[PDB]
Amino acid sequence: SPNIVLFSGSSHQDLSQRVADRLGLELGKVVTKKFSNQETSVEIGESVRGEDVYIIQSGCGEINDNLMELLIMINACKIASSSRVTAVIPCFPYARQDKKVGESRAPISAKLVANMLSVAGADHIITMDLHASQIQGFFDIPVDNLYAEPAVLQWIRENIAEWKNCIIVSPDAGGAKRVTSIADRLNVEFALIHKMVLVGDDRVAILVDDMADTCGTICHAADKLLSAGATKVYAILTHGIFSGPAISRINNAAFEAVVVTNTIPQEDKMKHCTKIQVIDISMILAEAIRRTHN
Amino acid sequence: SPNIVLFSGSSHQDLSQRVADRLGLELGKVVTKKFSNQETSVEIGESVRGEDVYIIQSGCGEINDNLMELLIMINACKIASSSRVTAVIPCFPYARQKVGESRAPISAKLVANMLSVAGADHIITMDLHASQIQGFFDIPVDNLYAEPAVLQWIRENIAEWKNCIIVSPDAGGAKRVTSIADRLNVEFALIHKERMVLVGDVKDRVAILVDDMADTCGTICHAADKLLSAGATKVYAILTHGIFSGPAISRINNAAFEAVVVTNTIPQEDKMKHCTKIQVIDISMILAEAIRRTHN
Amino acid sequence: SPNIVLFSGSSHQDLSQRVADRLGLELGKVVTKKFSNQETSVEIGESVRGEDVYIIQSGCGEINDNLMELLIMINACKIASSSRVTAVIPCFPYARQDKKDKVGESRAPISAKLVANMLSVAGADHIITMDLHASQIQGFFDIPVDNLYAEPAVLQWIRENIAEWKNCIIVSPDAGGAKRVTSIADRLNVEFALIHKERKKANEVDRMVLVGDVKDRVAILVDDMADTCGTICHAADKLLSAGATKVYAILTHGIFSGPAISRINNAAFEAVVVTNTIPQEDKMKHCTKIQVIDISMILAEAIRRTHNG
Amino acid sequence: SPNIVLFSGSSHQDLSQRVADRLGLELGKVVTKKFSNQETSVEIGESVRGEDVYIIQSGCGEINDNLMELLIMINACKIASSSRVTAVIPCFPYARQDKKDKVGESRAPISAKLVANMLSVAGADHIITMDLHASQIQGFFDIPVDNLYAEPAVLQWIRENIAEWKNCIIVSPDAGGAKRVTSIADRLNVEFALIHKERKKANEVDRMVLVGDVKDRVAILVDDMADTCGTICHAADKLLSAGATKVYAILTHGIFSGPAISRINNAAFEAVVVTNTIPQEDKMKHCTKIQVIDISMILAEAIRRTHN
Amino acid sequence: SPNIVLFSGSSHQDLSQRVADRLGLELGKVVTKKFSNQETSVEIGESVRGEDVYIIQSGCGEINDNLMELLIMINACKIASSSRVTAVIPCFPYARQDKKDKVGESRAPISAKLVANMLSVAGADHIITMDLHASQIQGFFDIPVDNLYAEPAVLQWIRENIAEWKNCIIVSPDAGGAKRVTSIADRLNVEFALIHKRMVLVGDVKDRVAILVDDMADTCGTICHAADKLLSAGATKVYAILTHGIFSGPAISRINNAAFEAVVVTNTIPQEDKMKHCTKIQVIDISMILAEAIRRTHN
Amino acid sequence: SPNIVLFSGSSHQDLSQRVADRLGLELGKVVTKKFSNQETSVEIGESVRGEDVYIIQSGCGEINDNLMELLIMINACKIASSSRVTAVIPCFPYARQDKKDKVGESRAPISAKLVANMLSVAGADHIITMDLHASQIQGFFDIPVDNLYAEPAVLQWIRENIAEWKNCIIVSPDAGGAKRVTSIADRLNVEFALIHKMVLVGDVKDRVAILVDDMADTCGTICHAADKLLSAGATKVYAILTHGIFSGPAISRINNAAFEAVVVTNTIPQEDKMKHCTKIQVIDISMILAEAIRRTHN
Ligand SMILES: Nc1ncnc2c1ncn2[C@@H]1O[C@H](COP(=O)(O)CP(=O)(O)OP(=O)(O)O)[C@@H](O)[C@H]1O
Ligand SMILES: Nc1ncnc2c1ncn2[C@@H]1O[C@H](COP(=O)(O)CP(=O)(O)OP(=O)(O)O)[C@@H](O)[C@H]1O
Ligand SMILES: Nc1ncnc2c1ncn2[C@@H]1O[C@H](COP(=O)(O)CP(=O)(O)OP(=O)(O)O)[C@@H](O)[C@H]1O
Ligand SMILES: Nc1ncnc2c1ncn2[C@@H]1O[C@H](COP(=O)(O)CP(=O)(O)OP(=O)(O)O)[C@@H](O)[C@H]1O
Ligand SMILES: Nc1ncnc2c1ncn2[C@@H]1O[C@H](COP(=O)(O)CP(=O)(O)OP(=O)(O)O)[C@@H](O)[C@H]1O
Ligand SMILES: O=P(O)(O)OC[C@H]1O[C@H](O)[C@H](O)[C@@H]1O
Ligand SMILES: O=P(O)(O)OC[C@H]1O[C@H](O)[C@H](O)[C@@H]1O
Ligand SMILES: O=P(O)(O)OC[C@H]1O[C@H](O)[C@H](O)[C@@H]1O
Ligand SMILES: O=P(O)(O)OC[C@H]1O[C@H](O)[C@H](O)[C@@H]1O
Ligand SMILES: O=P(O)(O)OC[C@H]1O[C@H](O)[C@H](O)[C@@H]1O
Ligand SMILES: O=P(O)(O)OC[C@H]1O[C@H](O)[C@H](O)[C@@H]1O
């Protein structure tokens, strides 16, 4: 008797209708405006009572507005007596830490967002490649942390002639688990960069990290990879935020291409950068939603 | 040995300092900045262990930015082992809101829960749009009133106050407007939009529209025009929270007001630059007393 | 396939059956009783497993006995593994507050919020109610609360029972009832008026001021409830001395406690009309002015709606 | 540091001021009435901010008005920013259960647990009560619960008031109070016995069984409370037909509902002794057999102990 | 439409399968082990989405590993989006309190309620258990708790195995099993007696078969001395019937040397290895009771 | 003013009294035993009312028992009306995982979050722990959690114990300790390399190699790692860990491994294992915990 109701806010209209087309359904009717004083207004237009409802919004643009907007729609479908409300958040906001010498720091912002999603009334969360997977434990809720790697792997094979050889390098220490894993799915060798010194060593170098925001490191990392004798250097990321200086710096850096997936709207930045190519994840999320709905 | 601690956000720094002056202390060092990707950042610069923390943040300007900042700073003081954390919210956001049934305040309630989930232990605000918002929490809430200062201003700035009339621009501020009447021994009038109709007698008397907030300001401008059509000598507009967004200031500039009075729960210095008819009432003392009281 | 079970408390049985009659079902077997030491006893007599339970009980009578009786059968249907328990509370208890000037600030609504938390902790999953004293009480919960209006019923009673309703005036007994009266006024496309008692001071006389004109019109005072009924009786007196042909009083909740019935028998009203969120039969037997408006359609349709669309 | 402000609800004012007298304090300014429509009103008259509040209300009279009155007063002192609120409930309401059989399972204590959850949600932080019908009720909370015993005062009354207490017999009126009597028995260095009324079957006659010997001995039945009192009256008669010189009854909680007074006026008790967890003043004016033990010192010290 | 899913833990494989058999099912695939560093590991082998899962685990053997295993498995099926997770706990752990009793008040059951809160936070939605040491433990949760009785099967065992049963006497080993003894006694229309500790006796056993009844039997001292006293009071025979037979250290050695006719327990706790050294122990099977309870809550 | 009260369990008697000495006080009276049926028993011997109590129990030994007893101790303290209860857990149990290679998604920390929720419901108000396998476990609570580092004491142990440390090389088995090796390395302005299965990237030829990671259990990875590190030229190989677990066949392995010393901290009882393995050396962290306890007590 519950049928899937699919919503979307203001954050990523394109991805949302893409998964709608993968599921065979239309987006639900909802009007999100902002009042003159900047208070977010969300009014549902469809009946969602007794339905399994999925609200898709990524933490990308004006996030605080997108996040507040998301919470308002979650609380709105919960007060409306829906059987279930699922937050589909491709890019989870506040996942990073801006961090000591003697102890760590509770991730107060990431756990604060978990608590607000929980109190708003969420009953399921679907997200992709979190900055730290242990954020699933910031919740007493099921959290699907889907990996984009198959997407990354197939894209390489399919797109890069030289993949069979090549080398995967991480721009940082913390990503090493990430390169390693991707490397051995290709039965391939690895190297890593640390702020600049490089470890490991005429191959197609491909830097892999979870997200790319200001992009400074990965550009200086590319400059060192070509100084270490690399044929080409690629940059493949899950979340492409490209804030500030980023696109200008990608405009002054020598990438064959920089690949990301569409957890974040990029078209308007594609128009300013010929490098960027985007992988479609409509089916992973689409498929994950359908799985959750049985 | 808790000591009072005053932290200010990005919303209303002048007001924060102003109550700090009233309490005789310094403000707590905190740097609030947004990251390149516009995520809010907060880094407290002092120790708050065993302290009575007070963060002064009004619901104004960039609302979701300001509230999210407030929540991050509250959490940061609770994970830091504060004795208590009190959110001072001069103008509470989202306070505002079918045949056959009523809607639920679902945003106000949502912010209540987000402040509670962040770790707030006490709330100090002023003039809630509905006093029952105190019940959206399970923690003490000191919904303060600006009337004392409004009656004082009225007596001391309107010559003919003994023979004025307090008018409510709507059908919901009635108990707010009779309150004033009873305290000035003056009558009130009520306006309804049905073409606006007025109930009451205004001919040859000074009319004073009073409400809690003014945002787009259309109802009070049209209300002034009718009150003058009913023969009112002068029109005042007295508001606790002066949001003044949109086309409002243009409207009061074209409006037949003698003056419009608001409180400093929201920054108004910028708006008076563009509007000579606005005047503000300091409520830094009201919040100051509420803090002192709550601190014991 | 979750089914639907209607339970009645003690407070208003008649309305429970009327909602049963409108839903096409009969009432679920439950025995409610007072022990010798006046301890509430609730034994439900039919299976509620996997069922959609609705318990109908109004905040009237011995308020605390009915409220505890309601909480116990909620927690009894909740421990017995029902799929959902909806508390249908036609008149919500503790909705008003005994404040009075607390100047410089307001007082927290401690009783209404405490009853909200007790309904929540008892195990309620949904709330239905009719005309809350303040709609923001919906926000005192974390579960869906439906506050229905009786306005449609008041408007149809008014059109079918008051001869010159076209030229009436809708009056509020107080400030704070202005929105309600205006609403009703615009709906009948008639105008409104307001009455404000000034607070007596040391050496005055009590006075009510009327803002608005009622001369030569049928006056209709409407508020959310009537309990002690002094304000509306003096309101009828003042409306008639302002030149009103008649005075009615139409409330959604008719509490009638203390001297109310004695006061209406001696007041100047044409009628005092209320809804059946509270049993009124034994009151009309002592007061011929009370008339009743049935609202079992609204509660019945809200129940049917809350079950399967 | 917080002081102690102590408040009395309507139910047992006399005992609250006895506890006040024991603590060297006076009761706090509070007005508790009823509105016309029977809603409870609680308005605190003094400041409780940063103080240690203790509210004494017993489970008696009109119980749901008193329980409601207790909860409203707790959440009123909690929202007023009290340092800590403690509910002193000498006789805890809804403690017993009307199960009166389950054959392959037991029933849940729905009412006692629900009252535990309402005290918790209202804002209670500590509970102090006396002789719970089941000690396990302490586990119905996530806050401390002090379930104090009246046994010292009962032993004291027995020694100073039963002439032949040295060879007295402690009797339990039921199977469940056995552990109770045992306790008392070994403390007086005397023996016990049990009364058990069997299920009346159709066509059988009312049959009560006595286990133990009470011949030529003073019998004293002992149970956590007394409410309608039928089982203990018949227990008296059975004990006397079994050759007991005298029968006493000592209960911690004297409810005395319904027909009890009349029952006891026609019962062959020498004395029915209870504690003052419930007002008894007006009952002794209709029953000369009722005698009260004061338990002010136990609650008084439990409070002083909780405050430090 | 959710189907019944039954899982079994380390504690009682036999009885688990045994209820699986009375239900017409097989257990679900679960693998359990303990890592080299002694940490409990659970890996469910089936999908439990949308399922009505039942986990059977008794408070026996090594209890903290069994209980923890139980909590990971509940807080494993619950996160896997099961329709509902039910803990089937035949013998509830930590149900008793170390009765070191302060003279003027009582002690709260801190361990039983602690076990209650950990089962609740793990994600349990229902609990099925048998003869709790105190029934009010049902009140340690805000979720439905089924406290099933073995007394039907005990009464039937008694009538069908003790020849002289119409004139026996139900006895209790202390002052807390009195209600229980009373209960079966009236069901059998038979008088009763109780022992309180010098050990004394209240009641008459002369020339009767005496049967000790209580919920659990552990180090067994009380029931052995109770047997000795009952025979000293002129009893023909002494039996001991309980629900949960824990039989910890010195117990087996104690009853082997005790004047018991037989000692009866249920299979809420595994015994067979205890029957290997003890010929007086006999087991009453209660798989039906749990089966009935599972099926009824599942509807 | 609340005094500070200290309790210890069965897990680490040695450590607990050391922090007691550093704080200038003695340990609290508590008898912990296990009933005949294996039911942990706790009985507090001293009044904790209105006091600030700290209970130290490590996820060492037989963990389920010590953790269950820890919970009993914390809840014994909460209903005894203690001013506050803080769980001092030097080595957090169930911190680790076995999720691995689910293709396309992670497995949630079901176990560590479960221990968090169990510590929270038991009544804990603060946690003091050291070197969590993942710092994000701090976020598994809503209460302050101090995840202290042992890195100061390891840096000073080396700087005073390895002669060839100005030019050393710091390394681990699989990358995952990278959020780690870097940190130790740059605090000495030193290069580094990492091992991943078996290959190694970086070069340590003719230099002292130093494996560092969080906890050692089985130890296979680090022994094979030590051997390969020689296969590439290091002068000597050391192994520096914080928690010294050494379960299963670890000690036989290290006795057969070519370490010049394997160094751990005393978050876990070591003495029994030092009598069987001469390569073990212990760094004492009682001061760090002492500072954290003292600092939260104000
Ligand atoms: N919104 C934000 N939140 C936290 N840090 C931010 C931030 N925006 C920018 N930063 C900056 O970006 C830096 C990137 O830090 P990272 O090393 O990516 C976090 P990490 O979790 O340690 O990654 P790793 O785990 O992959 O090392 C932050 O440390 C800070 O310097
Ligand atoms: N940020 C905001 N939140 C809610 N309403 C807003 C809003 N910004 C603009 N509005 C507009 O202002 C209207 C609400 O004004 P009111 O109806 O006076 C609030 P209310 O709570 O209904 O007042 P009451 O106290 O009179 O009921 C909205 O319906 C919409 O027309
Ligand atoms: N049960 C009750 N609760 C509160 N006040 C009661 C009462 N019974 C009688 N009263 C008295 O009658 C008065 C009626 O007050 P209400 O009108 O119910 C207050 P309100 O909730 O602020 O709403 P309003 O502003 O719409 O009038 C109370 O203030 C008090 O004088
Ligand atoms: N695992 C265990 N847990 C708790 N107590 C245990 C125990 N093993 C042995 N004991 C002891 O067994 C006794 C408790 O048994 P019981 O008295 O039957 C529980 P009770 O609730 O006090 O019983 P009662 O109803 O018979 O009075 C105490 O001496 C206690 O310390
Ligand atoms: N007691 C234990 N608990 C959990 N896993 C254990 C374990 N003992 C051994 N293991 C094994 O050791 C493996 C640990 O691998 P790790 O590399 O630590 C995964 P991680 O938690 O992501 O840490 P990393 O960041 O070091 O990768 C476990 O996944 C399992 O293979
Ligand atoms: O380069 P900046 O932003 O100035 O400094 C930090 C850089 O390092 C981070 O990983 C991003 O790549 C940033 O670009
Ligand atoms: O005329 P509008 O701008 O629509 O409304 C004017 C004011 O009245 C409205 O309720 C808002 O409060 C505005 O501030
Ligand atoms: O009724 P009285 O107490 O005389 O007046 C108080 C009025 O105010 C409330 O609105 C009641 O309904 C009462 O009418
Ligand atoms: O009230 P009664 O008819 O006596 O019998 C019920 C008895 O059961 C209880 O023990 C009460 O005290 C009552 O006596
Ligand atoms: O075993 P003992 O030390 O003699 O006494 C303890 C009694 O209580 C326990 O449940 C035992 O099994 C005994 O019956
Ligand atoms: O081969 P095992 O030791 O049994 O298991 C894998 C090893 O590798 C891991 O990092 C641990 O060190 C283990 O010891």
Author numbering:
A (entry chain C): 1 to 99, 102 to 197, 208 to 213, 216 to 308
B (entry chain B): 1 to 97, 102 to 198, 207 to 308
C (entry chain A): 1 to 309
D (entry chain F): 1 to 308
E (entry chain E): 1 to 197, 207 to 308
F (entry chain D): 1 to 197, 208 to 308
Task: Give excerpts from the publication.
Phosphoribosyl pyrophosphate synthetase (PRPS) stands as the first and rate-limiting enzyme in the purine biosynthesis pathway. It catalyzes the pyrophosphorylation of D-ribose-5-phosphate (R5P), obtained from the glucose pentose phosphate pathway (PPP), at the 1’ hydroxyl group position, yielding the catalytic product 5-phosphoribosyl-ɑ-1-pyrophosphate (PRPP). PRPP serves as an essential metabolic intermediate for purine biosynthesis via both de novo and salvage pathways, as well as for the synthesis of pyrimidines, amino acids (tryptophan and histidine), and co-factors (NAD+ and NADP+). Conversely, PRPS2 displays ~94% identity with PRPS1 and shares exactly the same biochemical reaction.
To investigate their distinct catalytic mechanisms, we solved the crystal structure of PRPS2 in complex with R5P, ApCpp (an inactive analog of ATP), and Cd2+ ion (an inactive analog of Mg2+) by co-crystallization. However, the Loop2 region in the catalytic pocket of PRPS2 flipped ~90° compared to that of PRPS1 due to the insertion of 3AA. This conformational alteration ultimately reduced the overall size of the PRPS2 catalytic pocket for substrate access (148 Å3 vs 302 Å3 for that of PRPS2 or PRPS1, respectively) and introduced steric clashes with the C-terminal α12’ helix, leading to its structural disorder in the complex (the prime indicates residues or secondary structures from monomers other than monomer A). Surprisingly, PRPS2 exhibited ~15-fold lower kinetic efficiency (kcat/Km) in R5P or ATP compared to PRPS1. Strikingly, in vitro feedback inhibition assays indicated that the enzymatic activity of PRPS1 was inhibited by GDP with an IC50 value of 706 µM, while that of PRPS2 was unaffected by up to 10 mM GDP, suggesting that PRPS2 was insensitive to feedback inhibition. Indeed, PRPS2 binds with GDP with extremely weak affinity (Kd > 200 µM), whereas PRPS1 bound GDP with a Kd value of 10 µM. In contrast, 3AA in PRPS2 sterically blocked GDP binding at the allosteric site, abolishing the feedback inhibition response of PRPS2. The observations also indicated that the four non-conserved residues of PRPS2 (3AA and Q156’) enable its enzymatic function by bypassing the conventional downstream products allosteric feedback inhibition. PRPS2 utilizes four non-conserved key residues to bypass the typical ADP/GDP allosteric feedback inhibition, enabling sustained excess production of newly synthesized ATP.
